[PDB]
């Protein structure tokens, strides 16, 4: 019995929109967004986490910094490392740099991560309703996504299998009175608040896993 709509931004779980600039680090922003919501659920405090800590330090786990990476490998790094620094103490500079992780500045931890059933939008909906914001991969390789402005995004050129961008599902919704009318996923991007709808995009929901949103979803266990 899941809610007809969810929006974690309205419960305090989501930090203001960030900007990855010219660095292939969307996976790091999707991972800090998910950990930010789980740490808030655990402590009641919303603390911005360091994407640069992940960019610089998680190559042992398989990430490649500004050249790409995966949210699961980020949650694996946080677990093996024993922590993750705050954004304030380890600022983002959008280029690969030397790892400067400082344990004394850690404000988050995880014990591992949970994988949502691949390809299953109903498993993703259950995770979003019961856990908090969820890290997901999607195909953002389209001019229509770069210039998205408002409304429910639906792009026929979208692939559900070949993905290139890590984002955060912070909720889901519908329009009008019928909960099944015009359903959408509420997605936080990391291209600045100026992109899209104050930094977010509504992606069509329950339309055959549009853009791959439920193909490779996960969240950290705290």
């Amino acid at each position: 019995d899941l809610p007809k709509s969810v929006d974690w931004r309205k419960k305090g779980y989501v930090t203001p929109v960030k900007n990855q600039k010219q660095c292939g680090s969307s996976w790091a922003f999707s991972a800090t967004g998910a950990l930010e919501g789980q740490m808030f659920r655990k402590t009641g405090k919303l603390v911005s986490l360091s994407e640069q800590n992940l960019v610089d330090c998680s190559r042992p786990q398989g990430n490649q910094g500004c050249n790409g990476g995966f949210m699961a490998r980020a949650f694996q790094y946080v677990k093996e490392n024993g922590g993750l620094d705050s954004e304030e103490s380890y600022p983002y500079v959008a280029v690969d740099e030397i790892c400067k992780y400082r344990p004394e500045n850690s404000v988050a931890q995880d014990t591992g991560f949970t994988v949502v059933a691949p390809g299953k939008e109903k498993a993703l909906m259950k995770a979003v309703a019961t856990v908090g914001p969820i890290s997901v991969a999607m195909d953002a390789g389209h001019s229509s996504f770069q210039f998205y402005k408002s409304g429910i995004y639906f792009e026929p050129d979208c692939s559900s299998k070949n993905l290139d961008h890590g984002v955060l599902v912070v909720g889901y919704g519908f329009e009008g009175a019928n909960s099944q009318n015009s359903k959408y996923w509420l997605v936080k991007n990391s291209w600045g608040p100026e992109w899209g709808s104050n930094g977010y995009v509504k992606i069509a929901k329950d339309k055959n896993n549009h853009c791959g949103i439920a193909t490779a979803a996960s969240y950290p266990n705290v």
Binding site: Q20, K21, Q22, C23, G24, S26, A140, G141, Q146, D164, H165, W191, G192, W195
Partner: peptide
């Protein structure tokens, strides 16, 4: 993906 400049 990165925003196009």
């Amino acid at each position: 993906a990165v925003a196009e400049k």
